[model samples]
Target: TLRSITSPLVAHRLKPIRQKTKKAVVSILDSEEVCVELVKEYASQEYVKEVLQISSDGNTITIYYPNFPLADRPPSPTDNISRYSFDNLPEKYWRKYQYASRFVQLVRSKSPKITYFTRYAKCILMENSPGADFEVWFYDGVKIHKTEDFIQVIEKTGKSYTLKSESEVNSLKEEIKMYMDHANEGHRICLALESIISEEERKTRSAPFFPIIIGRKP
Candidate 1:
């Protein structure tokens, strides 16, 4: 009995507002350490490795990953390139794309918020799926509760698909349509969450000005 009601439906138009993306080698606004922290997810999941100079308390954690198969090729004498084995590097300077255009295209077309693409030899970066970015929103579109049995989608229509950390929707063009839809549906959810208080007040105000005969004389 300690619960109560609230207002709803705010920034309903914000969905179309957020559906935009862009280009530019946007310079890192965050500090190097901040950048390192921003990419911690990559390092945490073995997408890359972060080697602290001393330990977690260390200041300089050199970030690196294994070199691609290109390391298998012979070096050109005229190239004057110093080729060294990466596995041989943990004892050394423990430090560290081609899907570039397509990834930029993904941001433009599908407007994916979580999945990332790296020019580190055309590699794609993915998190643990349905990350806080979108999943943090309401599950009215897609819901998950694994310990239980079958999940349900709340909709007037009974036909729809759920996305996976497995990424059944991550790569396929069919599911490419998947990521775009969830964002607006979820974003509008937070909007509803945001202005609920004001909407609820408007609700109360629209009621009787007074309960007595002194009700409304205006």
Candidate 2:
């Protein structure tokens, strides 16, 4: 036998903490499998400021645009039609040019390991509260960045927050509520969490898309 082939730094780099993991998607669409793929591609573009944290069983992907007033920079035909579309885009004349080529990255959740509120931190996740039926969790580190389509969290040590409501599951929501009920000296925030969508942000987390509603809910 001759000399064998062996990786030098392989042993050190193989550590689990250094590994890259694919994100999980929370699907509820008619054809979630396919739509999620499209969302993955869509997420790569430069327009996307951030993803939404709220739940979605409905149609249309809501993204945040830091450049308020869509009229500032609207879509152009010369651009990618396949990915550029919406149920309601601003009718105002769009700006002639604005980056729309494509940039992968930027940016939540479900009954699962969602939400984030800290009783001790005196702060709570102002994000839409999970429904009673939904399950909640708080991990060492709770942060879900860019995922396949929907949202998926990884195991990173979190310095703060916990899950909530009735029973074990429901009662957890109540605990989260407890923090909120006293948010006066309390705080609500967008922790290592994603619950909003941004179309295009001039600066990181500069804007959040607000749906025209006579009302809104958790």
Candidate 3:
């Protein structure tokens, strides 16, 4: 079961929606803490460590196995700086250039949803656009067993990325903590009702009928 920690109206709507979504996917049935513990353990495994290393203290360790070392400095710092500047240009129109580019790349790469979740949470504040701000519609992207897992994922991701503002990081951390505190009460209520109701009877019961209303400003 998944639930919302804010906006009772949204929480009410999410109750049944989360249950339906859960039935469609098969996920690990472990608490957030247990899943994170396993993730930590896996990160330390030989092969896993070779690709991605994690210290006993839980900090991620970067391992660069350089087979061959340069006999001498290949290029001057000035050359490197010039190449970097040439490769990237300032936005011709700042607001028109979408910050979503970075996020889209991560999503397309099929990186774990948890990774993207943390990236989005932090980036939102770093690239703040008070004039044309971005909105996070869905906060809970990963389905972990416990709330603690969510907190850890956010913390780990936050550490890895360079955020523009401390406020953004702090805000995301607090928002996620709030959700963790109240796992999924709405989803639980729906699941309980589901157990007592007959499948056919449940299907026959209709949800509120709200007609699609569309209009254009004159």
Candidate 4:
């Protein structure tokens, strides 16, 4: 009896495209069942300016302070100035506190779609290539400011198969090598599996997780 060749898991099989400015994770929901998620951090820094130089050129300079002071009848020296003349100034500390605020406001204004994927395994098979591990995830609609939660497995083995280098030679290690080679080829084959998923989705009258690109082969 011939043994059945099992397809590789969704996570270990696909090659995700990393964007120029940001990183993203793509997981196969099933076959056509895929979810792409982008991760971003929040802004937390504030902007502030320090005094650089005091213009003592007998001209009034505009400065924002806590309270306004009367001319010639300056309040207690300990009080913060509401305004200042460019005539007499000293070095002051300046720092930024705007980006964080801006980020907060921007996040508050927009609604973002949210989804979650569960990672079940990681691959550490080869010496040079530390490939992305496999994962399982659930699609949970859209979210506002939080990432969807899921389970993860960081280290695991990838798909494998058997092969023969020479028709005359028979060795276990050689067989292992053949299996690895078969597994590698299987990975390539799995890449096209998305198309099958798309076809099934179309037949089922469901939304395809991946938008079909016009010029690209599925």
Candidate 5:
């Protein structure tokens, strides 16, 4: 019964992929008539028969189709840039950085095959910001010791703070440390995934052949 019902649904679903490739033609001769003409062209396709209908009144364009479910398209680079707007800097630079960061993270999360190889490079690039080049660093010999032999030595202090002046470098250091930890964690995860994949392949391989069985009597 399962196979009987499955065949028709599979055949119906297969048509949509073919339908999507049919380009909707538009007329450049008349701007106002474009929508109407486009709909007419689309409705004429043989693949679109009974599945799609288009209507327009020179002002509004409407399309009707079967209530078949479709997968959502992944967000584009421009979409992410618009979603994460930063008012502090120029829109172009902010958008460029946002797009790159979003794309890298999306690939890292969804594509396990490429993630391990690109994780470190992608993480370092993600850490770059607009004012990164201008930032200054100073060395401080003072060391702060945590419990159980864990010690954080302040070998370098940022331009925002100094020993003589109270500044936001301490807070900035915390943020830097947070990102550093994230980068390291991502590296570890990639390594772990690689190990798991490798182990699975090893287990799936055929065992070496032997002329005689050692444990079994012939």
Candidate 6:
């Protein structure tokens, strides 16, 4: 069932992101089953000190990992502990491992939905990097538009260029809207336009691909 939902294109797209994070994909039918699986999978990881199943619903499950002092110990019971113990430790004393625990906690808090799950593994590389940054692009179907300058640049030289002015951006947006509207008029036309766009992009030798940036090690 999970395999059915995990399209080849989706898996390909997620490959790089998955490689960079402690992520897994697990097929889930109901809320309780999902929670049980998450706790079991995450808590079993060597890097995971504790797994707090904070929230769960029919569609999603959220888990948090607060800071812990002992990095080498096995998964222990969360008895007699209410709040995170790391609050007592000074900020200066926060090591990379402790920082990752806080980072995981923050990530879980932001987007709690469990779209899928995967087997957990010890994230040994978290402490290896000094810092990191990335760019994100959202491809909502309607916003799937490009600038005329960019198109021209790619058409002539097969490379990217900078947009000069607001008018150029506006014109490009309008051109994209025209094409999209024309495509939406009928199924045959939409398919034809899709083919044309693909052909043109190929001719220009500039098909958009996700960029991966690897930072220097600490």
RMSD for each of the candidates: 22.6, 19.9, 23.3, 22.6, 22.5, 18.4
Please give, for residues 1-218, the per-residue lDDT of candidate 6 as tens digits: 32232111111111111112233222211221211111223354434444332122212223344453323222333554332222233343233223333433333222212111112111111111112111111122122222222322222223444445556645654645453333223223323444565587678876432221222223
**Which one wins on lDDT?**
6
Candidate 5 per-residue lDDT, tens place, 1-111, comes to: 222221110010011111122333222111111110112233434322111111111112222232122212211112112121122233433332333233323322222
Better of 1 and 5 by TM-score: 5
Provide the clashing-pair count of each candidate structure. 7, 31, 3, 25, 0, 5
Q: Write the per-residue lDDT of candidate 4 for residues 45-132, one digit (tens) a residue.
A: 3222221111222122223332221122112223443444322323231111122122222322221111121222111111111121
Tell me the lDDT of model 4 at 54.
Answer: 15
- TM-score against truth, every candidate: 0.17, 0.19, 0.18, 0.18, 0.21, 0.22
lDDT of 3 by residue, 6-54 (tens): 1101111111110112112111111100000101122434111111111
Q: Ten residues in a row with the worst lDDT in model 5? A: 6-15
81-195 per-residue lDDT for model 2 (tens digits): 2222223323231110010100000101211222334433312222122311122233333332222232222334543433332234334345444433443222222321233
**Candidate with the larger TM-score of 4 and 5:** 5
- For all candidates in order, the CA lDDT equals 0.26, 0.24, 0.23, 0.26, 0.26, 0.28
Q: Report how far residue 27 has shifted in candidate 1, in Å.
A: 59
Candidate 4 yields a Cα-based lDDT of 0.26
The window of 10 residues in a row where model 2 has the poorest summed lDDT is 96-105
Give the number of colliding residue pairs in candidate 3: 3
Candidate 3 residue pairs that clash: 31-146, 32-145, 32-146
Better of 2 and 6 by TM-score: 6
Candidate that would win on TM-score: 6
Task: Return whichever of 5 and 6 wins on lDDT.
Answer: 6
Checking candidate 1 for backbone clashes, the offending pairs are 7-196, 7-200, 97-119, 97-120, 97-121, 97-122, 98-122
Off by over 4 Å in 3: 1-176, 198-218
